[PDB]
Design a protein around this ligand. Structure first.
Ligand SMILES: [Zn+2]
Lengths: 59, 93
RNA sequence: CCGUACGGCUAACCCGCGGAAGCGGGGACAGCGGUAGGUGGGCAGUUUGGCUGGGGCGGCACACCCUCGAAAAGGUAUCGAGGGUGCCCUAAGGUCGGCUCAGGCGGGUCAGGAAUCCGCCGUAGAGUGCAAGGGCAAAAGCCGGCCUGACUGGACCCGUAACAGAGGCGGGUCCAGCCGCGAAAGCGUGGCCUAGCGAACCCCUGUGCCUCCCCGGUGGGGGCCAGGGAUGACAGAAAAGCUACCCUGGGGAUAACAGAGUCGUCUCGGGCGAGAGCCCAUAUCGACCCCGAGGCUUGCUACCUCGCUGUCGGCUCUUCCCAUCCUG
RNA sequence: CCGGUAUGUGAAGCCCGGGUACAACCGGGUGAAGCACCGGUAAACGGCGGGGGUAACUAUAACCCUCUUAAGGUAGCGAAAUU
RNA sequence: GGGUGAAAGGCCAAUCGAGGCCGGCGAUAGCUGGUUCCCGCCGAAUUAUCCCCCAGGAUAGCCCGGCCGGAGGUAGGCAGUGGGGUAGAGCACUGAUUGGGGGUUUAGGGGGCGAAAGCCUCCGGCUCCCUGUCAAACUCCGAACCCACUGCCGCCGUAGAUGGCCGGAGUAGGGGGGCGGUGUAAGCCGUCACCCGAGAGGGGAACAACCCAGACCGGGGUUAAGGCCCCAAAGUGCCGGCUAAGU
RNA sequence: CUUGGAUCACGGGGCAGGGAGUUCACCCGAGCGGCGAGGUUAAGGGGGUCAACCCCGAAGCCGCAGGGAAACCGACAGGUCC
RNA sequence: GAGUACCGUCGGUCGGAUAUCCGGCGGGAAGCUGGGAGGCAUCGGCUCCCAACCCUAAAUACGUCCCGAGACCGAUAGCGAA
RNA sequence: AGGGGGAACGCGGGGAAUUGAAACAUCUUAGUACCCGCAGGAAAAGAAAGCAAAAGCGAUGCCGUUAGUAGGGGCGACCGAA
């Protein structure tokens, strides 16, 4: 037989791959090995639209 | 069809007429030690399509008998003719 | 001793964050390797029979027995005519003795009376384990008595299959052995004759012998003889479909169509005369039976044509027949 | 298709017994998934029953006898691109 | 056997229900086409059994060549010993089939005088006799014909037959004509084995098989089938009669 | 090809050159020739006028005795007739 | 001369058949009073040998090159290519 | 020191289908075609934990026979040593 769309997606071709070079970087907190017991303080300086996220991000 | 349990017949061993009791042969299954079964098992191993013919449920409704006649005087059995086909077989005394 | 189930632990292994030291989380599970079972058109290889007044569905008279067809020796085919078997019987088998059947009539008790009683006539009309045909009367049938030749070892013949080749199957004539019935002569190798089943390879049983790699033991294996287990598509593959997206090689050995043949059917006629027609056979209508023409209606057949052209209807254009609607 | 109980069955392996100076072998038990058994699920695949009789006259029968299944075509549309 | 697909099996360099190039590869087919000089001697077959057999093959039958062996054989006829149930015929078995004249009356529903299935009769059954009809699966009879065998007549054979051994094949789609079964018929299926096939020449207007007749080469004659007004070799031939429809 | 071809059955414009039962291994037969109860060499070796010629080489193969699954057993080199 | 000889099981391969070799998985020795083979396994005799480490000529295969020769072809032949 | 090149011959691994069996699945085609790696003028093998059987032989490789034999195998078609 011939192949299904769900089987062609596993190959990893351009027709199926996400365009993440368009996005703002990943979102992660701060590593424990650098926030062990310090209680860091920060200021919000920008709020931005992110194309890969469904939620707005802040800088 | 009725058949007697006792028959006076020629015995090849005593070389005279004696009394014989009648019995049906009772079968048994294939032995694993036989060369043919060795060969069959040797052909069944590995990556293969099935190697031999396989008729599913091949049987006659009316078969022949296999009877042995055992002598009282001497204790030995023998065959007496060819078998005949009959559905009911009943040993009457 | 070893286990199973559960509970916990961390030090193997796994996950993450980090140059790495480690940290944190899981945890002897998972994952990895080996083996065993199940599910599994997700993916492959194949099969999916034949005869056949084309093919298909139908039907298995796809192996056998009898009568006809069948032409007074033998042989002889069709999806030719009429029917049966794929069993049953320790007796329905072997033998010895004795007896004779169906029906009809006349006698008696009885509703049809099934049947029991008596006499006569009586060539088989009866009966035979089973179809059909054949055969049979001091029996091959009925009634009884004793038995198990429905056996072992072997030989030569006939048929399937004429003439004219055959594996397997079936039948016939005998030689020996051991036995049965019978006073004895004789008969008996299943069923009065002709249907009632089957290769190689493998397996099971019986029986006594031969044999297994230098020799000898034990367990186990191989071989010769006999019986049995099946292939009905019955001289024997283990086996479902679609193609109008279709491909190759071929075929008028074979359908659709024009032609060719034939005319049951069809169309068009006729002979006689049942009679109908106020009465009157035939102005008109003409039953039931019987004899024909045509091949423009449909069918039947398969001679021609499988890459001649395969097309129906309509428009256009020419010509012919009469079996005459109008015009003479 | 999903879930649940195991009572059955269930291969290798393990265990018991026989057999073999050892094996091959033979007979028992245990033995998971699955099969079986109990249930849930149709905007899952799919399915949704005739002969019968009867009214103030000819009619047709709301309705009544009825004959079986898991159930017996509801609202609508209807000689339909379905007759 | 992969891609890509707003899904048409659409498109992937004029190539797609699995691209193109080279290789396996001189793949395989029971199917189609082809196969190269001369003269002489002989000369068939399309039918039985078996095969997933029916456009294919094997075993036999029908042809050829060679050897062995050593005296009988046989396609025809006559007379005999035996066998056979066809044509025809008939009713003696099996089974079909018209009518009358009588006897037993009833196996059985009908009614009648039915005082009740009644003594007794009516439509009907049983056994005769006379009259009339039949048979692929009937026979009291029964040919022509065919078959085996014996003896003779004829033919073949020591210039070696009949027969046996060895070897090489082809043939498994037949047809015309006569016979049979089936079928409205044309046809289908078998059978005989004269012809065509594989057969020139002379005739039927031409014609595979209807008639005469079986063919090395060159010449001379006589006949066959049929024919003789002209086409066209040979008769406007002879005797007796018919036809008026170009029959 | 076909039962059947002048066919409205297939192939067939002209000429010249090319173009289809071969080789090996095994088996069955024959026509001839050599030796003959025996026949024959292979690989190889020696010599020479050096791929031709001459000599050696019986390993093996067939045959001389068969029957039988096997263990095993083991025959008329002529008695009579046509 | 140790994950070796040997046993069991799975896959491949072989003429190797209950008796060929290769690999994977699970087990696993003796070790000089020692060990192995002899076509199913095992017991006893007899015969032959000492694995699990290394090297080694000659006789053999080939000819992109050279040399010689030929019942080979002779320009549509012969290598595709005179 | 290595890397790249070399017709055929050489060593080690991976591994089809057409086809035949008058179908086809074990088998055959075939350890073939093709793929990967590694050497040389030759390579590989090679000095008995062997062959045998009442006698004995004595490392490897090549040629002729053993032999279409033992043996394998829908015990079919075929395959096949020492
Ligand atoms: Zn006894």
């Amino acid at each position: 037989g011939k192949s299904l769309i769900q089987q062609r997606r596993g190959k990893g071709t351009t027709t199926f791959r996400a365009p993440s070079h368009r996005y703002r970087g990943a979102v992660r907190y701060v590593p424990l090995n650098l926030v062990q017991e310090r209680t860091l303080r920060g200021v919000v300086e920008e709020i931005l639209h992110d194309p890969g996220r469904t939620a707005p991000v802040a800088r | 069809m009725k058949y007697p349990k006792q028959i006076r017949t020629y015995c090849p061993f005593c070389k005279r007429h004696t009394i014989h009791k009648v019995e049906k042969v009772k079968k048994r299954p294939r032995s694993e030690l036989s060369a043919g079964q060795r060969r069959f098992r040797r052909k069944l191993k590995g990556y293969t399509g099935f190697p031999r013919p396989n008729p599913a449920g091949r049987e006659k409704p009316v078969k022949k008998l296999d009877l042995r006649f055992r002598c009282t005087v001497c204790g030995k059995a023998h065959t007496r003719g060819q078998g005949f086909r009959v559905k009911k077989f009943e040993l009457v005394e």
